[PDB]
Each structure stands twice: as structure tokens, then as C-alpha cells.
Design an enzyme around this catalytic site. Structure first.
Site, PDB file in Angstrom:
ATOM      1  N   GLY D  67       0.794  -1.212   0.000  1.00 19.27           N
ATOM      2  CA  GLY D  67       0.000   0.000   0.000  1.00 19.27           C
ATOM      3  C   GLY D  67       0.829   1.265   0.000  1.00 19.27           C
ATOM      4  O   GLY D  67       1.823   1.369  -0.726  1.00 19.27           O
ATOM      5  N   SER D  96       5.884  -4.987  -2.018  1.00 14.67           N
ATOM      6  CA  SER D  96       6.989  -4.046  -1.849  1.00 14.67           C
ATOM      7  C   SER D  96       7.137  -3.552  -0.418  1.00 14.67           C
ATOM      8  O   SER D  96       8.200  -3.699   0.198  1.00 14.67           O
ATOM      9  CB  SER D  96       6.792  -2.858  -2.790  1.00 14.67           C
ATOM     10  N   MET D  97       6.072  -2.973   0.134  1.00 13.49           N
ATOM     11  CA  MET D  97       6.159  -2.485   1.500  1.00 13.49           C
ATOM     12  C   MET D  97       6.043  -3.626   2.497  1.00 13.49           C
ATOM     13  O   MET D  97       6.667  -3.576   3.563  1.00 13.49           O
ATOM     14  CB  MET D  97       5.070  -1.444   1.760  1.00 13.49           C
ATOM     15  N   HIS D 121       9.184  -4.228  -6.040  1.00 17.33           N
ATOM     16  CA  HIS D 121       9.302  -3.369  -7.207  1.00 17.33           C
ATOM     17  C   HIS D 121       9.678  -1.979  -6.709  1.00 17.33           C
ATOM     18  O   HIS D 121       9.932  -1.784  -5.516  1.00 17.33           O
ATOM     19  CB  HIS D 121       8.020  -3.395  -8.049  1.00 17.33           C
ATOM     20  N   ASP D 170       9.145  -5.521 -11.208  1.00 21.81           N
ATOM     21  CA  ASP D 170       8.608  -6.506 -10.279  1.00 21.81           C
ATOM     22  C   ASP D 170       9.415  -7.795 -10.343  1.00 21.81           C
ATOM     23  O   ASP D 170       9.744  -8.285 -11.426  1.00 21.81           O
ATOM     24  CB  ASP D 170       7.140  -6.785 -10.591  1.00 21.81           C
TER      25      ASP D 170
END
Ligand code: AGS
Lengths: 350, 192, 192, 192
Positions: D67, D96-97, D121, D170
Site C-alpha cells: 500500500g 513491496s512495503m 518493485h 517486479d
């Protein structure tokens, strides 16, 4: 025989900054001596007994007032507690325990038990807790008050004198309780908020409402003077229990400046104790105003500052006392505020 | 979400919401647009405090961009009818109707924050229909504008002519100017 | 959803929500966009803590992308009015209004996380109508821009001219840069 | 709906929600997209556990598609600030996060399920406006990418050059490959 003016003058030596409470108690005790002394077998009989209800902050000197009065007073005195009591044969304690404790002070003399006075602390702790769907029979709450009603009014309860050496005695003494005086007092919590809502103004949380800025700057005591029985009902006490204690005392508060007075004016002040302890050695003890101010702040920081004076003073002079016999040709001792903090050593004069 | 707090009493602990706790101290919050539902809720709060105590001052904090006029006028008459002095405070913003309820507070008990802002303009409306009906709704809203200016002058002390000129268009008033205008009594810069 | 926790006390066990438990320790959360409802809720929390203890420091954690200006200025006046020192902390992000409340905290008790980010720009607005009305709303928003720069300089110590140049457009400031800019006092990297 | 459970204690029986019961055992759930509200709630949970016990390991289960970046970085600094070792587990997916918070756990106490999947990514963004503003937002997002790659190398042990090439687009990493990459320590296949 004791005159209210004379008894108040004696109490002033042991009490500082409390005047309203002295007048209230002096009249009651004088009447009590007169009631028991005078036979009262006249047209008017069975004089009523005005029981005293003491209210004040914690560590205000309530216990000292009863004990210091008991010291000069000839009749015996006892210091009981209300939190230990548990009604209807419960684990905590039977009400009768209070009476047997009194007899030890009276050397098992029934005539002396009616003469003596009784004191109770933490009376507010037994305030009627009101949680509807939990028990509906609060042993620690209301229930205790119902048991004390008959006790304060007057009744005779069987009490084994001295406990008995063995089963052989198996007897009990009848002790009256009508003529006995009862002093029930305890520091009530949250009482100031109750009276503020109904008496002075629209105070509280909001902006215009007076904030509690004067937490320690001003004394809440003045508010307690306007207390009445109706306010105690909201606290939890039963009106019947309050009727048993018509008289009321305020005992507003103790002040930082009063602590300085407590160390100099009273006969039993700590300064006079240590002063005489060193006078015999050919040494003099000098206390400076700066030193006293530091003691006040340290005591105020800790809880029950009035009871913490011994610790602060003893630690300060513990090291000096150890070396005073060893030291010679020392006639004076000086204490400074820095020494109270612990960063300095007291000055010595030869 | 609303946090829950605990208020300690002699009888026992009681759980209160942040809005209900302040209500116990005669404090009401006016937030968001003024509508029929929000306005009717504040009226019920004032009456409840009147019955509990008719001699204690009430504090009303207003932070709203305004709204319906008819919903706001019900509160104004209520504040004047009841005996307690309704103190008003402006937090954040006070539009046309928010300003009318602000000045309607008790004289001498009106405050505005140092960085608050007040805005006042004329009533807004409109209608669609026959020409005969447009004239009816126009005459009614015109009477309200005249009525709203008369009461504004009463509390602000200004003249009716002055309020008419200043309300022709939107007019923003800073916190210091509001004091000079008679709309408020003082400013609560710091706590004393 | 909000989890429920149990706080052990001498009287007994009490169930509290995660937000109410931290409120008991003088901690308030400012999350999401700043609006009239969210701002009016925080004000009641600050006032509630003032009555409980006016001598204990308050901690305010801010993680928000900013929002309405008028809603945020009500909080700024509250922090300065009350006696307690309102400590501010930036978590995640602090936009234009979030940055103004961040620096407005008590001097020496302002912190920012090592990876937090602050953004400052000029006030945003707009209007549609006659040219006479646009001039009114334009003069009003211009005063706010001048007022917001004056207060930002007061707490940051920078000059009014420097803040004006830095706020002409969006300006991102890392956590170390905030210290050099006088916006904060230190960074709470690890516990000591 | 949330099921209710009963926890037996010496004092008596207490009813708890499924999430609150696990919270008592130092367990926090990170579900769904990372936003300002969900992230601000987890931070309060970590602080609550720190006061209760600062010497017991915390377990954080992550199942989320990622997010907002700023919301997640507030959690990373919190995990590093507090003394307890924050154990992280990846269930289902870690974007990612989610991957940055997974690898940020205490060294030696990071695990991944046998069938979990991680994806990494570069940061995503965008802006619309003048060219001068686009250049500002471009430099800001560039700093984050550089900062996010530096920390990934610090915890993963790989070189910054390797992280830069692998994060350009990605890249999916299975559970076994995550161990070889230094991102995790082991896999919790079965209970021993
Ligand atoms: N008037 C006073 N003069 C001298 N010392 C005082 C005085 N009042 C209080 N003190 C000090 O306060 C200490 C405690 O006094 P107490 O009578 O026990 O106070 P208290 O409020 O009765 O505490 P409680 O109610 O039993 S918990 C005494 O030992 C003194 O050191």
C-alpha cells in the site's frame, strides 16, 4: 474541671494551623467529662451524647490530635480501624473486637471503659459501593455501617475479660456503650468534586470553567466548611449513620510554612529532640531557614510528607552523629540547604 | 470512533464517552453543518441541563460553516428563553448562522480564539414555479433578512443600517476586529 | 476493527479499547485528513487531560496528509492556551497543516522519526461567482497565507522572507533537514 | 463477524475477541492494504506491548498486497526503535512495503511459510501540474527509492548495486529463494 480555653491552649502546643477543629472538640470533651462526672439525676435525665465526625486530608494530624489529647488526658485511648471489620460472621473481623481492645488500655476495669474515648481511621473506605448487578450485599460496603448503628447508640455486649487463662473461667463481662464516646473520621476521596458541582459554580473540563490550576497553590479546605449531611448521601453513607454523628470537623490542610512551625513551636518538635541530644555533649544545633525550605520540598514530593520528616532529618545527621563523639573541641554544628540535598557536608565550628 | 474514559466516583467507576463527559459539565459541541437533526439534538441537551440546574452557566463551543436558517433560529430562541447564561466560544470558524448564535450568547460571556475567523453574509434561497409563488417566497426570505439584522444589532450594539451594509456580501472578521465590533467580549489567549 | 485490552488495577480488571488506553496516559492520535469532526474530537481530548493533570506532558502523534486549515487552527490555539507542554511527533508524513501543528509543539519536546517526511506549501482555495466576490475571498486567503508564515517563523526561528520563498511551491524536507531548519529538536532513533 | 472466546483466569472467566486474545500473547495482525488508519493502529499495539514487557519477543504476521509507503515507514522506524525483537512472518503474500517490513525484523527471527510469495518493485507515484512541480515530486520519490534500497541492503546483506538492478521491475521470490537472498532466516514447515 478542664476549661475549653485551657484545654485549647494546651492543644495549641501540639497542633498548628487548626483552630475550628479545636473549638468543636473542646466543647464535646468538656461536655463528656461533665456528663460522666455529674450524676444527672435531676428533672432532666439521660442527656444525649454528641458524637464527633472528623474530616480532613491524609496526614493532617488526626491521629496526633487524639493521641496528643490522650497523653495529657487521664482517661484511656485506643486506635481502631474500620477496614478490618466484616459483618455477619465473615472472614475479616467481628465488630466485638473493638471492645476487647479497649479493655487492655483500661486494665479490665468496666468503670474506666465508659470514661475512655475511641478513635477510628479510614471511615470513608467503607463508603457504600453501588454496583447494582454484582452482589447486592456489599460486606465491605453499607453492611458494615448497619452493624455500627447499635454499637454507637448504646448496648451491652459480652466480652471475655483478659481472654481467660483457660476454659476454667468461661465467663464474660457486661460493658455498657451508651456513655462511651466515638470519634469516627477518615480522609474522604473525591468529596471535593461532589460539593463543587452543587455549591460554587459551573467548574470542570471546559475553557471558561475554573481549571484545577491551584492543585497545590491553594487549599481545598475552605470548600469542606460548607459540607452538609446531604452531600455525604451521594458519597454512600446512610442517613441513619450520619444522624449518629451530628458534629463535624473540617481540618482544612497543612501548609509548607506550617511544617517550619511544626519543627520550632511544638514541644515535641524534632529540632528540640536533637538539640537536647547534643546539648549534653557540649554542642549546639543550629537550623537555618534555607535548610527548612529544602526539607519542605523533599517531604512534599513524597507521599504523606508530614510523616516523612524523620527520614529526611535522620539521613542528614546520621553521618555527622557518627563522627561527633570522635571529634573534640567542637561546640557548634551548622546545617545548610545544600547539605539537605546531599551535595554538601555540614559546617563544623571549633 | 469515539474514545471511552473512566470517571472515578465514591460509589464506583463509570464509563463515559468523550462527548457525554463534557455534557456532565454543562458543555455542548456544535460541529458541522446546521440541519434539522443536529439542531434538534442541541436543544434537548440544553433542556436537560435546565432541569438538572437552572442556575449554572452553560458553555457552547461552535465550529461550523453554517447551514439552514430555520434550524438555527430554534436554538437562538431557546438560549434566550432559558434562565442560564449560555456562554459561546468560536473555534475554527463561525459562518452566518454560526455568528448569529455566537453573538446571541450571554452578554459578557462571549469569547473568540486568537486565530478564529467569522464570516457573515445575507440569507440564501431560491424557488422554481409560478410568478405568484416566487413573490411569496421572496417576501418571506426578505422578512428574515430584516429580522436577522435587527437581532444582530441588539447584541452587537451596532446600528441596523450598519449591519445591512456589511451583510450585503461575504465579510470575514478576524478575532481582534470582532471584539471592536461588539460581537464578542474578549479573547482567551492564554489560561489565567 | 479495534482490539480490546485489559488493564489490571487494584480495584479489579477493566476492559479498554486500544485508543482509550493510550488516552489514559495523555496520548492522542491524529490520523487521516483534518476535518471539522476529527478536529473537534481532539479538542475535547486535550481539555479532558487538562483537568486530570495540568502539569504532565502530553504526547501527540501525527500521521496525516493534511486537510482543512480552519479545522487545524483550532488545535493550534488550544495547544498554546493550555499550560501543559504539548509534545508532537511525526510518524509517516506531515503535510502543510500537519507540519504547522508539529512545529507548534513545546520547544525542546518535538521529535521526528528518522524516515519521516514533511511537506509544506501555500494555502489552497478557490471560488466561482462575480468578480466582486472573488476579490473578497482572495484577500481573505491571502491574509491566512501571511498569517501561517508568521507563526511558522516564530517557532522555527527562521525569517519571514525565507518561509515565504520556501512555501511558494511544494517543498519536501527529510528528517535530518528538519533539525537543521529548526522545525524539530531531535530524532528518536533508539530508546535510551 | 468476529468470534468470541473465553479465557480462563484465576480471578474468573473473561470473554475476548479473537484478535484481542492473540494480542495478550504479543501477536499483531497486518491484514489488507497499508493505509494511514491500519498502520496507525498497529503502532499503538507495539507501544502497548513494550510497556507490558520489553524483554519478550513480539510476533508480527503479515498478509497484505502492500500500500502507501509513508504509512509503512512509520512502522519500520518503530520496530527499530523499541528494544524487543520483532519477529516477522509472511503469510500468503508480501508486496513491496510488506517485504520491507518483513525483512526489517530482528536478525535470526524472520521466517517465511513454505508456499508464501514475496514481490518487490520500485515506488509508484504520479503528479499533474506545472513542470516545476513535477521536478520537485520526482526528486522526492527518487530519494525514497534510494533510501529504500539502502535499508534493504543493510538488513539483507546484499550490495546496493544488486538491490538496484533487482528492484527496477517486479521480481517474485519463492520461499526457498528468499533464504538464499538473505531476506529471511528459515522456513517454518512443521512444528518441532
Ligand atoms: N499539628 C501537627 N503538629 C506536628 N506534627 C504534625 C501535625 N499534624 C501532623 N503532623 C505530623 O504528621 C504525622 C502523621 O499524623 P497523623 O495524625 O497520623 O496524620 P493522619 O492524617 O491522621 O494520617 P492517617 O489519617 O492516620 S493515614 C505525625 O507523626 C506528625 O509528624
Amino acid at each position: 474541671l478542664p476549661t475549653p480555653h485551657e484545654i485549647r491552649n494546651h492543644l495549641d502546643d501540639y497542633v498548628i494551623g487548626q483552630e475550628q477543629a479545636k473549638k468543636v472538640l473542646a466543647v464535646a470533651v468538656y461536655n463528656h467529662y461533665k456528663r460522666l462526672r455529674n450524676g444527672d439525676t435531676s428533672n432532666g435525665v439521660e442527656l444525649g451524647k454528641s458524637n464527633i465526625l472528623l474530616i480532613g486530608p491524609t496526614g493532617s494530624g488526626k491521629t496526633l490530635l487524639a493521641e496528643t489529647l490522650a497523653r495529657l488526658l487521664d482517661v484511656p485511648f485506643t486506635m481502631a480501624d474500620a477496614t478490618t471489620l466484616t459483618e455477619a460472621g465473615y472472614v475479616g473481623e467481628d465488630v466485638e473486637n473493638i471492645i476487647q481492645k479497649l479493655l487492655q488500655k483500661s486494665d479490665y476495669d468496666v468503670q474506666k471503659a465508659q470514661r475512655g474515648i475511641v478513635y477510628i481511621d479510614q471511615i470513608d473506605k467503607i463508603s457504600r459501593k453501588s454496583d447494582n448487578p454484582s452482589i447486592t450485599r456489599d460486606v465491605s460496603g453499607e453492611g458494615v455501617q448497619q452493624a455500627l448503628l447499635k454499637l454507637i447508640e448504646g448496648t451491652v455486649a459480652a466480652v471475655p475479660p483478659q481472654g481467660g487463662r483457660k476454659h476454667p473461667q468461661q465467663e464474660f463481662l457486661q460493658v455498657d456503650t451508651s456513655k462511651i464516646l466515638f470519634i469516627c473520621g477518615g480522609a474522604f476521596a473525591g468529596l471535593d468534586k461532589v460539593i463543587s458541582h452543587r455549591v460554587e459554580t459551573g467548574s470542570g473540563i471546559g475553557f471558561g470553567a475554573t481549571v484545577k490550576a491551584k492543585s497545590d497553590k491553594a487549599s481545598e479546605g475552605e470548600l469542606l466548611a460548607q459540607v452538609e449531611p446531604e452531600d455525604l448521601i451521594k458519597f454512600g453513607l446512610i442517613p441513619e449513620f450520619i444522624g449518629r454523628l451530628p458534629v463535624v470537623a473540617t481540618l482544612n490542610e497543612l501548609s509548607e510554612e506550617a511544617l517550619i512551625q511544626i519543627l520550632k513551636e511544638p514541644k515535641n518538635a524534632l529540632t528540640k529532640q536533637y538539640q537536647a541530644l547534643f546539648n549534653l555533649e557540649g554542642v549546639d544545633l543550629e537550623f537555618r531557614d534555607e535548610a527548612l525550605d529544602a526539607i519542605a520540598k523533599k517531604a512534599m514530593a513524597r507521599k504523606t510528607g508530614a510523616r516523612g520528616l524523620r527520614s529526611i532529618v535522620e539521613a542528614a545527621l546520621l553521618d555527622t552523629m557518627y563522627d561527633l563523639p570522635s571529634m573534640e573541641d567542637v561546640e557548634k554544628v551548622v546545617i545548610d540547604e545544600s547539605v539537605i540535598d546531599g551535595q554538601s557536608e555540614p559546617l563544623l565550628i571549633y | 470512533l469515539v474514545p471511552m474514559v473512566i470517571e472515578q466516583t465514591s460509589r464506583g467507576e463509570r464509563s463515559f464517552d468523550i462527548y457525554s463527559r463534557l455534557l456532565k459539565e454543562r458543555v455542548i459541541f456544535l460541529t458541522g453543518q446546521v440541519e434539522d437533526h443536529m439542531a434538534n439534538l442541541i436543544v434537548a441537551q440544553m433542556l436537560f441541563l435546565e432541569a438538572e440546574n437552572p442556575e449554572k452557566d452553560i458553555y457552547l463551543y461552535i465550529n461550523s460553516p453554517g447551514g439552514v436558517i430555520t434550524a438555527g433560529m430554534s436554538i437562538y430562541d431557546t438560549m434566550q428563553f432559558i434562565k442560564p447564561d449560555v456562554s459561546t466560544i468560536c473555534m475554527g470558524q463561525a459562518a452566518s448562522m454560526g455568528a448569529f448564535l455566537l453573538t446571541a450568547g450571554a452578554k459578557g460571556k462571549r469569547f473568540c480564539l486568537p486565530n478564529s475567523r467569522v464570516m457573515i453574509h445575507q440569507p440564501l434561497g431560491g424557488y422554481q414555479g409560478q410568478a405568484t409563488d416566487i413573490e411569496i417566497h421572496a417576501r418571506e426570505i426578505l422578512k428574515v433578512k430584516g429580522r436577522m439584522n435587527e437581532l444582530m444589532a441588539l447584541h452587537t450594539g451596532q446600528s441596523l443600517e450598519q449591519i445591512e451594509r456589511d451583510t450585503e456580501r461575504d465579510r470575514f472578521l478576524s478575532a481582534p476586529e470582532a471584539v471592536e465590533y461588539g460581537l464578542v467580549d474578549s479573547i482567551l489567549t492564554h489560561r489565567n
